[model samples]
Target chain A: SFLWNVFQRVDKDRSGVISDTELQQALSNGTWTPFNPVTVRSIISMFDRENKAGVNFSEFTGVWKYITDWQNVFRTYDRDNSGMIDKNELKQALSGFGYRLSDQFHDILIRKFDRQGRGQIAFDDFIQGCIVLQRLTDIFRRYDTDQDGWIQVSYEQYLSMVF
Target chain B: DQSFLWNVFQRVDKDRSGVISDTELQQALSNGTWTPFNPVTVRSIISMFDRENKAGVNFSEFTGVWKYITDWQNVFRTYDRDNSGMIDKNELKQALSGFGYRLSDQFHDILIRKFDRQGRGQIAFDDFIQGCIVLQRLTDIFRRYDTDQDGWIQVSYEQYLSMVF
Candidate 1:
């Protein structure tokens, strides 16, 4: 499944890996629009396992898989298939992922991702969203002994977790 | 619209303080199902329309929200003619457009998908009202932080926490 041609085509800078700048122009959000800087940043941060701040050939495979998989996952929750996700859909989606959240949390989650002020979450926005959600949850769970989505941390501990 | 909304309540002014509180509001607002206002809805309405303090709703603010509810019903009925209790997708577009929602055709279509289950071109009144509340409520939050006015916002962690949670 290794396509050297594809890699070379996208590596406009001819770097061995796909950096944020490369991917920003290289990718579409399935919306006929280039992906946002935050999404590229998020993707780079997520797949840059080597801490190189980019996706290497080795990780490109997984990154593609993650993209395709999240697309499927996005539609699964956006059952209405409106090209966007609402608070109710988000609630059901997050719940399916074994998250325990309040109704208010669900509402706020949509706001965080509703970058267009549509009161809804688009596909590209949802990508950065879940990254934030996944990272924050994992960070919170580090302090949550019970895995109940509730955690208590010292001021220093909390600040350290986020910073 | 404002006068119609103002005509909606009277007894909720239990103390004549000219302010509407949670308990008073709970007894006042009712959907077609006759259910009391959800606690979250009450808080959202008060917080969204409140002025000066985290106190109760002043007269004008309360009337404005009243107009919102009545306007919702008016739109609901105007589109759901013949009592079908379901509004067609384009009809919904027209209705909300008149409500001054400046969204794209695509985004408006997404609203139909979200609020209409019969997505078969039919959205129920209850779902319509729920969608209206959220759209209005979230926009209120968006406008506050959208100093740049690009529909979205940039906020720090504390601003995010206080406003969101």
Candidate 2:
């Protein structure tokens, strides 16, 4: 697979496992939007479920799957194929995943993810933002228990719940 | 919840304008109608749900935020064992794992530092929610990458190519 070829190339040390350093180098290699090392490390931990410190072939392929899905999501939202999602496009994308961002929050999001400062999000940025949005929605859903799109616990009640 | 929400809306919309302005929210929070959040963060939250762009939260919009805050508080409580109202590094790890993340020690330490803004070596309720925000995001990303149900990928090269391009 193209991914295997990429992985082997990334595993410059030829170790059976891909260490954090190697993965970082591989991801930052040619043409790919270089992810912050912190971001890369976070992403790697998600795949290294066994806490193995490195990924085996299976773990490596898992990331490929995510990129593929994320690519689909990005393209779907980028209907015109402008290769970027402007503000409204991003709002719509998040709404699809059950998050309705306020204008202020949306601006903050664009500012944080729109690294190019073009006031638009490219594919990589879109993926990163969507991942965060999706997770937030998931957590929100769990707490909203009544399915009314909000969580209703009081702070005091909440403190007791966790304690 | 409706009555509770109505009472809040009434208190926050002190001028009876039928909407809770950012000022109303700020004052209400600071006045102790609920646990106070950063004014800036609260303003952002208000803006996020103000679909009408009214610069305030309508009754329905107010309800939405109420739920958001309550849920986060719930999340914070769940991990704050020993009833300390804060989470230490170990608790943070357990909490993240419960949310399905397996972050590195480096990442964990970094998170603690980032969330523990007071330099307390522990994250208070507010800071804990902040951490959860990031953890939830990473968890979503990870889940997508783990396509195979067996907890790791074992896809054929061709399948991999097809999935990743």
Candidate 3:
């Protein structure tokens, strides 16, 4: 029942494997946010490696390598690791990575993710987080043209893949 | 710099042999082969050394990072409380604490423990730097993706793309 509950929450559309749209919704909601338009473009450039809107398993894994894992994600969300990421939490996390956002806008985002007004994201809320991370890993594998298990990507690699 | 060459030879000639051998070069260069430098940051550092296109580094090339390089020997010297030439995961973990990068339980197990190829409690210089080197690279990638140069990448799909890919 535990895995089933977790799986059900992840299968936002009730379709197994966390479909793209459902995953996107989760990423957009309160849980995550890219810093600005340029960042969005760069991220899209990464996912669109083959210029395909849809990501397969390989593409998914590649991108996720940079974002997944509790140590990594928490390090990102909880800049101070005080637990509980708030609006100020959002700003602090983003700022550490060299991005900035309007405090007012960040507040709105916090509300969206914390739709229940609980103020903290439960484990279920990170379902999309898992899926999205898997998606990035897929991307990494694809870029690892050598199939050597590691992505030998660099700025040139990005340019080749994105443009 | 002849002085630099003298310094590198001093470090490389661990056994006091006049001529350097393959193993000696590996030890001097921190186990890196004379392969093209893969790390982005080290491209320049390698150029400065002007290593000969040979399988091993000679006296002059060895010293480039010699006098100045923070060799693992020095690292082990600093952490090997028992004066052993090796380090294990625990010692590595303790050393990293100074840099503000604490290892979580999973990390301590998967990364540190597994990496400590030998079961010593301290981390040898090479492995320790290797860990931080990898972390540094990952952080650079993460920080670079913070495209807006903001502290955090946006959660939105569009924002995600712009920041990292």
Candidate 4:
């Protein structure tokens, strides 16, 4: 009932649905800045199963859950309580995940994910960066099956599989 | 269906070994671009069909790998809106969104950067598929620990290491 009331208020036109702009206005990335339009539209697509281009009150509940979860992750890792993850914070977070990354990689990460050019990573960007890092690492490990530093790749041996 | 697949098998199994290998699959399957398919991508697919831990796949397994490429090809064509042989940032955002990921444009920018091996702002088919696989898999692994189904997950260090290792 609380979420339903919140949804109605944010629905703007009482259309029983939350549109992209409505959801965007109702959300933020740890600050006053509205949720990214692409993110908003995409989330809407996730629950707007009827191809309605917006989320119903029922769908809004799911949206709320998803955002709150990401919010929790961001809040948990925001060590300085500054509502953001600085370089040192990110380094600590990744290290906890068992990555023995170098200082250069950390520097690259902060710079790469810092879209605002603020030298800090925001919540949305943080999740995005983490996903990429995990993905790439997984791919690399698949090739380096031995967990050794190098992969054994050979063209002829590769050709053997063909011929 | 079997007959058609057999025909495909014959064409791709250049040495007539009754099996397909990484090189064969790579040469046979188009990456939806001019460049060759990624070696890593090839092995990832071949590994799936090599159930016996053998280095190649027979006709039976070839179908799975064949469909894998076909399915990915459809996905590539679906999101390659401009037919530029690769996916640009705009196309990628749509594809990722279609896959139900909630990500920001800035994140999308970084995604394009990470996948773009050509110094260009576009992603090739192999790159696109591999990235999507990573996203899907990481999300699945993350979900297993998020018992409450929230986006957040909590795991003990050992549990975490076990999953990674």
lDDT of each: 0.64, 0.59, 0.45, 0.67
Please tell me the interface RMSD, in Å, for model 3: 13.9
Candidate 1's C-alpha runs over 4 A off are A30-33, A49-51, A146-163, B1-165
Looking at model 2 chain B, which ten-residue stretch has the lowest summed lDDT? B156-165
Instruction: Compute each candidate's TM-score over C-alphas.
Output: 0.45, 0.44, 0.33, 0.46
Model 2 lDDT on a 0 to 1 scale? 0.59
Ranking of all predicted structures according to lDDT, beginning with the best and ending with the worst: 4, 1, 2, 3
Clashing pairs in 4: none
Give the C-alpha miss distance for residue A155 in model 4, angstroms. 38
**How far is each candidate from the true structure, as Cα RMSD in Å?**
22.2, 18.0, 21.1, 20.8
B1-165 per-residue lDDT for model 3 (tens digits): 566356656665668775544445444454232333223223333434555432233445545444434654465578776666555556656665655654454445445453454564434444544445555455466455455433233233323332333
The alpha-carbon lDDT assigned to residue B130 of candidate 1 equals: 54
**Where is model 4 more than 4 Å wrong at Cα?**
A1-163, B13-16, B148-150, B154-159
Compose the digit string of candidate 3's lDDT tens values, residues A1-163.
3544654464555544444444444333233442222223334355755655433444545444543453465557766555445555656654554443456544544443442456654233333323443455456445445443333333322333322
List runs of model 3 lying over 4 Å from the truth.
Answer: A1-163, B1-24, B27-64, B118-122, B147-165
Q: Candidate 4 lDDT, tens digit per residue, A4-74?
A: 68888887887998878777787767745655565566677767778788878777788788778877776
Candidate 1 Cα deviation (angstroms), residue A94: 1.2
Error of 3 at A91 (Å): 41
- DockQ for candidate 1, C-alpha atoms: 0.02
Expressed as tens digits, the lDDT of each residue in A25-74 for candidate 2 is: 65531225665444466667878879787777778788767656766786
Measured with C-alpha atoms, the lDDT of residue A48 in candidate 3 is 55
